[PDB]
Structures are given as structure tokens and as C-alpha cells.
Design a protein around this ligand. Structure first.
Ligand SMILES: *[C@@H]1O[C@H](CO)[C@@H](O[C@@H]2O[C@H](CO)[C@@H](O)[C@H](O)[C@H]2NC(C)=O)[C@H](O)[C@H]1NC(C)=O
Ligand SMILES: *[C@@H]1O[C@H](CO)[C@@H](O[C@@H]2O[C@H](CO)[C@@H](O)[C@H](O)[C@H]2NC(C)=O)[C@H](O)[C@H]1NC(C)=O
Ligand SMILES: *[C@@H]1O[C@H](CO)[C@@H](O)[C@H](O)[C@H]1NC(C)=O
Ligand SMILES: *[C@@H]1O[C@H](CO)[C@@H](O)[C@H](O)[C@H]1NC(C)=O
Ligand SMILES: *[C@@H]1O[C@H](CO)[C@@H](O)[C@H](O)[C@H]1NC(C)=O
Ligand SMILES: *[C@@H]1O[C@H](CO)[C@@H](O)[C@H](O)[C@H]1NC(C)=O
Ligand SMILES: *[C@@H]1O[C@H](CO)[C@@H](O)[C@H](O)[C@H]1NC(C)=O
Lengths: 162, 249, 120, 99, 49, 50
């Protein structure tokens, strides 16, 4: 945060610092050819079409001639495996902003990390609609908003609570 | 063997409306609940499609220019129509493509056939005399009141000859039915030869000869844009011709 | 994910930082707009349990206890009638809290008139 | 058409986002719109030129999108300021201003 | 009227559609502004003779 | 050469559209003010000073 804001003192608030781009674990090449893995972010190569995505089971019933699948925005989100006649959805690998919630450096040096739009199971861990918040203890009491997190969630320093 | 047929009765070929027929899948991409615009070789909606009859004495087998693409509609019963002939000069000088479906199996050949002036098949109740340089053979599954509607679209782009097909159960007696039916792509054929003229193959009935009751329609493709509608199951159910009328535009 | 593309992109300078800063400014501006419009009272007023207002009926605009969202019938109708590097940030104020703010404003303007807007 | 004003804002934002994603499919004069195809098909001396063309086209598209978003944000900010003024003067008091 | 220029222009995508849409929005906005300023009465009143 | 002409003309057109949108926003603000003056000054008597 200090490097991002170009200052050695950081005021109280939430500051977006980086991006959490999940890294691809393996490379999968499928031809009508290594083994196929699922539920992991891998580099897929389906019949010369390459990319990086999580391959999950699909509920889309493809026609026998169709091989690829596109959404509204013309991006390939479905594929048919050449070796075994099955349909797979490509969800994109998890990404989001990484924001640092801190009070003033005059008060404390404790920080909390918010991963925007990221589930907590694949990254003091609390799941919010805004994303996964690490380093803040969730409490059941309600106070006035000090540092805005989002989706009705706010953070404060008293340790950092959410 | 070739036989001249001299018992035809003179009649001009008919014309009718294409309605909303001739639509095919532009690519092999599944799409769900979306509208997609494509600029491809398509048949215009409500266009003037040429109508030919086989009835007894009409035996319509002319040789037509291929143009940029061909839509073939067949109101067929008892499977009289057996195949097609594609080429440029239809002799041994050039190389020609032959598609046939006899009583047992479907044969695709690319040879320099010495074609007959009147080639036909015969059923009792003769297409070429020679084939010198054959470069490709492909054996495939059987493709095939009028009871069956057989719709085919033939394109020759980038040396690839695309055959799109659809079978529809119909009960209309004379003209084309009014409705929507998307043609699934059937055969992508790697020929890489020039095609400018085609001729369809009929079957005679012998008991001279008798022509079975059949009717076919020939339409030509032009480059245009269509707006295709994809349902929840990925089947094309509706299309819009962007150049037909201002409402569709 | 192309490292060569990012290496080439770094030659153009701080364009990406400028665009991120502008989008972040717009995103915080939306929350500021909602805060300015709806959060004009710091006391959450509540209506009396008995709705004796001299013959005036406010059932269509007051929150419905039967509904889990605690919205008015008009508000419920309004919510029913509205239907690669890209992320959508959630709003700071949820629909329940905005409904609560409108409920507080309605309770203040029904039980206290304009007095709550100028003081106690 | 009672709630057209909110619907127009939602439609404009969604349309702008959709157009921004659609701009990725344009090659902007390069051989292909896919970076992976350029990396796999060409050597780095020509690949740098192709990615340079794609980067400048996508950067121009993103700058256009950000400029449109800033103008729309200014319009929505003006509308929100008007809404706050109505909330203060019509709900929290009785206003003598005509209409 | 250059066909080659239009063919090269198609590579850049829907920029032209965006510009036309923005200009159309401005054009309808001007009419909306005139309606808002002047069309505030639905009765055409006339002065006595 | 045509690509250079296209990019220059497209940049000019985008710039023109951008200032047109900014001026449209300014004119819209002025029109909103004019509508407010028409409602409060012509169709009623206004107590707002100046
Ligand atoms: C059927 O009729 C056609 C046309 O009359 C015959 O084709 C002719 O064949 C001779 C060769 O014997 C050529 O010299 C002519 O130029 C051809 N005519 C045309 C118009 O191409 C065909 O041979 C006949 N079939 C049989 C079996 O005789
Ligand atoms: C205020 O108005 C509401 C609705 O306008 C009244 O609720 C209705 O009550 C009658 C009789 O109990 C029911 O048959 C209707 O179905 C109710 N309508 C709704 C929408 O709930 C209510 O009775 C009125 N009076 C008070 C004191 O609340
Ligand atoms: C179809 O073409 C024929 C001549 O080729 C013409 O007589 C007929 O009127 C045309 N029909 C339509 C519907 O255009
Ligand atoms: C159909 O044609 C093929 C190709 O020559 C041939 O081998 C087959 O015997 C034919 N069928 C019959 C019943 O003759
Ligand atoms: C085609 O056939 C003729 C005679 O059958 C022969 O002379 C010629 O060389 C052949 N061409 C090729 C390319 O095989
Ligand atoms: C294809 O055949 C037609 C007619 O014979 C001819 O005019 C055309 O030039 C041919 N095309 C090629 C590429 O040979
Ligand atoms: C889509 O398929 C389902 C069954 O999978 C069927 O119930 C539904 O009617 C189909 N949709 C259409 C438009 O036919």
C-alpha cells in the first residue's frame, strides 16, 4: 500500500493495491493427448484451441456436430472433449482486485486483505459478497461505518473487526 | 451405357416462394439463448425458387449453373432421387464430383467421369461410361402425397465442399410447406476442385419407362447477413433476413 | 496472461493506472451519490404499532412485515419491474438498508412532519 | 414504460460493457485478434508488431469506454444531486417552488 | 466511396456504431431539452381580443 | 497509407464526438436551469434571491 500510494504514511481507509490472478497449475492437451483433469485452473488445448481455465462438468446438451460453445460476448465458455464424447464448461480462472484495509500508520500497522469477487475456499477468514476478507475478525455487533468494505460490510479498528 | 430419352412432354419449369427455408448452421459453435449475426452465403427469404417435377410425362433433369451456392429442396416419396453430379465441363477433360446413394450404401467419388447426356438410375417392377483418374473415394451412411422433405445446401468455399442436410416429415400434397427448419451440417468434403455446374440424378421405373412422382426445387445462395435465434437447447428456431424489408433490417 | 504483451504494454507508461483510477473514482462516486440521497437522517424512526392517522392509509408505502425483504408494496413492485478483466463491485448500501432509510424518512415525515429534518 | 429512466441507465451501462468486450474480437489490422495465435504462429520480431497493433487498438477502445463512463457518471452525479435536493426540500419540508 | 478503405475500416470493429449512437443520443437529448423547457403546459391559452 | 489515414480520421472523429458530448452535457445543464426558471419564475412567484 505504501508503494502504491507513493507515501510512507497511509491514512485510514481501503486502498486497492494489486490483482489476485490465480496461476495455472498444469497443461492439458486433448486431441481426437495427455490425461484430462477437472476442477482445476489449467492450460487447456482442445483441438488446437488453447487457453487457461477451470474445466468443469457441463449441463449443456450439445448437438452432435457442434464442438465449441460461446456466450453473449463471443467468448468460448463450453467445449466438447474429443477423446470421450462429453461436454465441459470452461469457467475463467479466479481473478479480482486485492485491496488493503488499514487504519492510519500513526495508530497501528495491522492490515486486512480483501480479495474482490473471490471465494474464501480457493484463496481470521470471512466470506462477504464483496469477496474474501482475511485478517479481520467478524463480530455480530453493529456499529457506524468506519472503513467501507461493501455489501453492507464495514471495517474498523478497536485488532481490525468487520 | 447411355440412353437418350425422347418421350418427354414440353413444359416450362415452374417458380414458387422460398418462404423461410434454406437456413443452415453457419459454424460448429453451440450457442444458448442468444442472437447471432452472420455474413455467409444464404438463401433470401421469400425468394423465387425454381420448381421441377417428375410425373407421368414430365422427367425434369436439366443441368444448372452452380453459382455461389445451391439450395436443393426435395418433396420426395419412395426415394426416387439418388444423387448429384458436380463439375465444370462434365467430361474427362476436367475432374468431377459424384454423389450417389444406391439401394445399399452411400458412395462419394471424385473422378474424371465420361458422363452421359442423360444420366439416370433404374428400378424394375447408367451415369457414366468411364472413370480414368480417381483421386478421392468416401463411403458413408445412408443420407436419405409427398411424405419426406429433404433439404440440402451445397457450398464450395476455400476448396472445401460443404453439404448441409435436414429431413422433415411433411404432409403437404403439392407445394413447399411453410415453416422453419435449420439445416445441420452433414459432410465437410476436402476436394479442392472447381465446380460451376451441377445435375441431379433421378430413377426410372420399368414395367418403356415410367417416372416416379417426385418434386424438387433449386435455389441459389447470395452473400448476405442473417440474424439467427438460438433457444435454450441450442437449436436454431428463427432467423431474420437483414436485407429483405425495412422491418427485418 | 501473455507476459510479452505486458512487457510491450509497459512501454506506454501509466495509461492503465489512469484508467483504473478513473474507474475507482466513478465507483466511489456511486456510493457517495447513494449516501447523499438516502442517508439524510442519522436516527432510524419507526411508526407506531397502531396505524391511527385520522383516516389516512399508508399501507402501500410503509414496509410490509409479512415480506422477508421488509419492503413496501410499491417498493416491491418497483424492484420486480426492473430487470477478461471485468469485475462488478457491489454497492456499499444493500437494498435492505436503502429500504430501511426510506422507512425511517417515511416514519419521520408521517409522525413528526418536517420537524425531524430541522432538528429533533 | 413507467420506470424508463432507470432502465435506460442499466441498458446503456450493459451495452457499453458488451461493446467493450466485443472490441476484443477485432484484430485492428493485425493477422488475428488472439494473442495466443500470434505467439504460436510467429517469431518475436513480427509478434511485437502484431501485439503492438492489438495493444493500441484495445487501449483506444478502453480509453473510449472510460471517457463514456466518465460522462455518464457526471450525468448520474447531476441527477443524484437533484434527487438529494428533492429529498431535502420535498420530503423533509414543504417546498414553495413551483413544479 | 472507397471499397478498400471500408474493408480496412471493418477491422477496427464497432467504433462507427458507437459514434453514431452517441450522436443520436445527443440529437434526441436536444429535443428532450426543448420539450422540458417549453412544453410545460398542455392547454394553449389565448389572450382576450 | 489508407490505415494511416483511417487512424488519423478516426481519432479526429472520436475527439469531435468527445467534445460534442461535453458540450451536450453543458447545454443539458443550461436547459435544466432554464426549465427550472420557467417553472419557478414564469408559472409562479419565486422567493429565491437573484
Ligand atoms: C444422347 O443425345 C446427345 C445429344 O444429342 C448425344 O451427344 C452427342 O454425342 C456425339 C458423339 O456420338 C457428339 O458428336 C455430339 O456433339 C453430342 N451432342 C451434344 C449436344 O453434346 C449422346 O451421344 C446421345 N446418347 C447416345 C447413347 O447416343
Ligand atoms: C389500508 O389499505 C389497505 C390496502 O389498501 C387495506 O388492506 C385491505 O384490507 C381488506 C380488508 O381487511 C382486504 O380485503 C384487502 O385485501 C386488503 N388489501 C391489501 C393490499 O392488503 C387496509 O385495510 C386499510 N386500512 C388500514 C387501517 O390499514
Ligand atoms: C419468378 O421468375 C419467373 C421468371 O423467371 C417470373 O415469371 C415469376 O413472376 C417470378 N416470381 C416471383 C415471385 O418473383
Ligand atoms: C452400390 O454402389 C457400390 C459402389 O460401386 C457398389 O459396390 C454396390 O454393390 C452397389 N449396390 C448394389 C446393390 O449393387
Ligand atoms: C488423366 O487420364 C489421362 C488418360 O486416362 C492421362 O493421360 C492423364 O495423364 C491423367 N492425368 C493425371 C493427372 O493423372
Ligand atoms: C472454374 O471454371 C469456370 C468455367 O469453366 C472458369 O470460368 C473459371 O475460370 C474456373 N476457375 C478456376 C480457378 O480455374
Ligand atoms: C428444450 O429441451 C427441454 C428438455 O431438455 C424441453 O423440455 C424444452 O421444451 C426444450 N425447449 C424447446 C423450446 O423446445
Amino acid at each position: 500500500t505504501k508503494c502504491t500510494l507513493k507515501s510512507f504514511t497511509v491514512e485510514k481507509g481501503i486502498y486497492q493495491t494489486s490483482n489476485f490472478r490465480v496461476q495455472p497449475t498444469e497443461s492439458i492437451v486433448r486431441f481426437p493427448s495427455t490425461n484430462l483433469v477437472k476442477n482445476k485452473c489449467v492450460n487447456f488445448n482442445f483441438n488446437g484451441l488453447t487457453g487457461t481455465g477451470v474445466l468443469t462438468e457441463s449441463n449443456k446438451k450439445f448437438l452432435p456436430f457442434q464442438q465449441f460453445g460461446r456466450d453473449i460476448a463471443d467468448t468460448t465458455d463450453a467445449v466438447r472433449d474429443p477423446q470421450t464424447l462429453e461436454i465441459l464448461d470452461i469457467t475463467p480462472c479466479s481473478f479480482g482486485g486485492v485491496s488493503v484495509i488499514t487504519p492510519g500508520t500513526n495508530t497501528s500497522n495491522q492490515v486486512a486483505v480483501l480479495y474482490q469477487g473471490v471465494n474464501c475456499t480457493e484463496v481470521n477468514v470471512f466470506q462477504t459478497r464483496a469477496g474474501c476478507l482475511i485478517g479481520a475478525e467478524h463480530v455480530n455487533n453493529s456499529y457506524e461505518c468506519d472503513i467501507p468494505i461493501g455489501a453492507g460490510i464495514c471495517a474498523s479498528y478497536q485488532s481490525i473487526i468487520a | 451405357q447411355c440412353v437418350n430419352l425422347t418421350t418427354r412432354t414440353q413444359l416450362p419449369p415452374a417458380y414458387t416462394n422460398s418462404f423461410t427455408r434454406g437456413v443452415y448452421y453457419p459454424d460448429k459453435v453451440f450457442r444458448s439463448s442468444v442472437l447471432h449475426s452472420t455474413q455467409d452465403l444464404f438463401l433470401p427469404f421469400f425468394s423465387n425458387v425454381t420448381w421441377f417435377h417428375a410425373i407421368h410425362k414430365r422427367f425434369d433433369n436439366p443441368v444448372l449453373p452452380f453459382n455461389d451456392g445451391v439450395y436443393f429442396a426435395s418433396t420426395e416419396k419412395s426415394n426416387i432421387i439418388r444423387g448429384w453430379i458436380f463439375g465444370t465441363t462434365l467430361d474427362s477433360k476436367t475432374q468431377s464430383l459424384l454423389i450417389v446413394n444406391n439401394a445399399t450404401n452411400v458412395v462419394i467419388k471424385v473422378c474424371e467421369f465420361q458422363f452421359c447426356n442423360d444420366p439416370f438410375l433404374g428400378v424394375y417392377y447408367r451415369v457414366y461410361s468411364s472413370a480414368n483418374n480417381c483421386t478421392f473415394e468416401y463411403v458413408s451412411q445412408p443420407f436419405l402425397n409427398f411424405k419426406n422433405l429433404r433439404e440440402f445446401v451445397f457450398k464450395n468455399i476455400d476448396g472445401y465442399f460443404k453439404i448441409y442436410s435436414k429431413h422433415t416429415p411433411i404432409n403437404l400434397v403439392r407445394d413447399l410447406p411453410q415453416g422453419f427448419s435449420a439445416l445441420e451440417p452433414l459432410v465437410d468434403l476436402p476436394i479442392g476442385i472447381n465446380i460451376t455446374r451441377f445435375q441431379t440424378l433421378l430413377a426410372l421405373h420399368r414395367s418403356g419407362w415410367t417416372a416416379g412422382a417426385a418434386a424438387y426445387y433449386v435455389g441459389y445462395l447470395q452473400p448476405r447477413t442473417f440474424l439467427l435465434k438460438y433457444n435454450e437447447n441450442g437449436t436454431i428456431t428463427d432467423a431474420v433476413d437483414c436485407a429483405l424489408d425495412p422491418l427485418s433490417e | 496472461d501473455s507476459t510479452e504483451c505486458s512487457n510491450l504494454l509497459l512501454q506506454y507508461g501509466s495509461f492503465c493506472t489512469q484508467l483504473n483510477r478513473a474507474l475507482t473514482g466513478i465507483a466511489v462516486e456511486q456510493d457517495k451519490n447513494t449516501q447523499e440521497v438516502f442517508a439524510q437522517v442519522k436516527q432510524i424512526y419507526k411508526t407506531p404499532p397502531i396505524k391511527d392517522f385520522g383516516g389516512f392509509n399508508f399501507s402501500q408505502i410503509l414496509p410490509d412485515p409479512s415480506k422477508p425483504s421488509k419492503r413496501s408494496p410499491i417498493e416491491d413492485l418497483l424492484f420486480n419491474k426492473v430487470t477478461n478483466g471485468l469485475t462488478v463491485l457491489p454497492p456499499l448500501l444493500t437494498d435492505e438498508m436503502i429500504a430501511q432509510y426510506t422507512s425511517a424518512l417515511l416514519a419521520g415525515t408521517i409522525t413528526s412532519g418536517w420537524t425531524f429534518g430541522a432538528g429533533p | 414504460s413507467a420506470l424508463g429512466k432507470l432502465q435506460d441507465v442499466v441498458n446503456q451501462n450493459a451495452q457499453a460493457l458488451n461493446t467493450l468486450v466485443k472490441q476484443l474480437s477485432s484484430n485492428f489490422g493485425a493477422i488475428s485478434s488472439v494473442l495466443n495465435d500470434i505467439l504460436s504462429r510467429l517469431d518475436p520480431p513480427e509478434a511485437e508488431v502484431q501485439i503492438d497493433r492489438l495493444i493500441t487498438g484495445r487501449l483506444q477502445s478502453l480509453q473510449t469506454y472510460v471517457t463514456q463512463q466518465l460522462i455518464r457518471a457526471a450525468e448520474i452525479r447531476a441527477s443524484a444531486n437533484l434527487a438529494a435536493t428533492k429529498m431535502s426540500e420535498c420530503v423533509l419540508g414543504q417546498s414553495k417552488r413551483v413544479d
